[PDB]
Amino acid sequence: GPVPFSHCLPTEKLQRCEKIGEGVFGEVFQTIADHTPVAIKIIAIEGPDLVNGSHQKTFEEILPEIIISKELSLLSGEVCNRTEGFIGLNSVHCVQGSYPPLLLKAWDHYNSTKGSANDRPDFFKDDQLFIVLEFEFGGIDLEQMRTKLSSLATAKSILHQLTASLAVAEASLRFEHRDLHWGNVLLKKTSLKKLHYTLNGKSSTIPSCGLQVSIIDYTLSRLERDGIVVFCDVSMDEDLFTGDGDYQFDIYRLMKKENNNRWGEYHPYSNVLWLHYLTDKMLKQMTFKTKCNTPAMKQIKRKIQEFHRTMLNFSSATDLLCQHSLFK
C-alpha cells in the first residue's frame, strides 16, 4: 500500500525543503537529513486530471526511470564496471495524499524568486498518488554554472568524467542516456584530486580539478540486462523532434536518424551525440572566470576544439574513452 508523505518527509525534513527544479511532470526539492543534503523528486501518477497542462503518467510509465536509476546507482559498488558518475538513489516510495502545505511554501518561494512554468500544486486530493524518488544531492547543474567555472581545464575534467561514466554504463548495461542536456549534468566540489573508475576490469583515474560530475535524469534512457530492454518508446512522439533554438533539439532528431526510429535497439552513438552537444556548450556558452591567457591554457583550448571536431567519428563513449587523444 502507499505511505503518507510524512513517511518520506518527517516534519524536520519537510521543514527544511527548498525547491530546486521543475518540469512538466513534477517538482524537485532539496532537504537535509542526518546533516546531509538530499534531492527529492515528486511525480503525480495515475490521476485523470491535468497537471501543468499534461496528463499524469501511470506507475507503469515511471517504472523505467526507477529501474534505470537503481541500476546506475549500483555501478558505484560494482567491480569490473564501476563508476560513481551517476547520481545515488537512496529510496523510492509510492505516497498518497494532498500536497504538504510545507512543500507549497517552498514552491511559492521559488515562484516568487525564480518564477515557475508550473501550476501551484495545491489542487491534489487526499487520494492522489505520487512517486517520491530520494537521490544524493549532486550539486548544481552545468547550465546554472555557465558563469561559475574556473577555466577550460575544468571543462576538460568534466568531459572526461562524463565520457568515462557513459563508457562504464555502456559496458555494463548497454546504456544510452538519450537526454544529456546541460540541466542533467551536476557539479559538486570535491577535495579528492583524482576520481576512480573501472572499465571491463581495468582501473584508471581522472584529475578532478576540484569537481565531481553526476549525471541525472533517466526518463528517456535505455539499458538492458540479460536481453530484457528497459526504454522509453518515443517513436510516435509528436513534440520531441520539433524543437529549435539550441543544438539540444537537433540531438533528438539526430538520435532518431541513427536508430531509424527504433528505440529498443542499442545505438551507443547517441552517447557520442550528447557528449558532442556538451563539448559544444563548453566552447560556445560556458564563460570562464579565467580565460586562456597563457600558452599552456591556449593548448588546452586547442585540445578541446580538436575533440569537438573529431568526436563524431567515434562509435560510442567507450570508443572515445579508449581511443581519443584527449584522454591520453
Binding site: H181, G183, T219, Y252
Partner: peptide, 6 residues
C-alpha cells in the same frame, strides 16, 4: 532546456 514544456 527541458525536452518538453507546457
Amino acid at each position: 532546456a527541458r525536452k518538453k514544456q507546457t
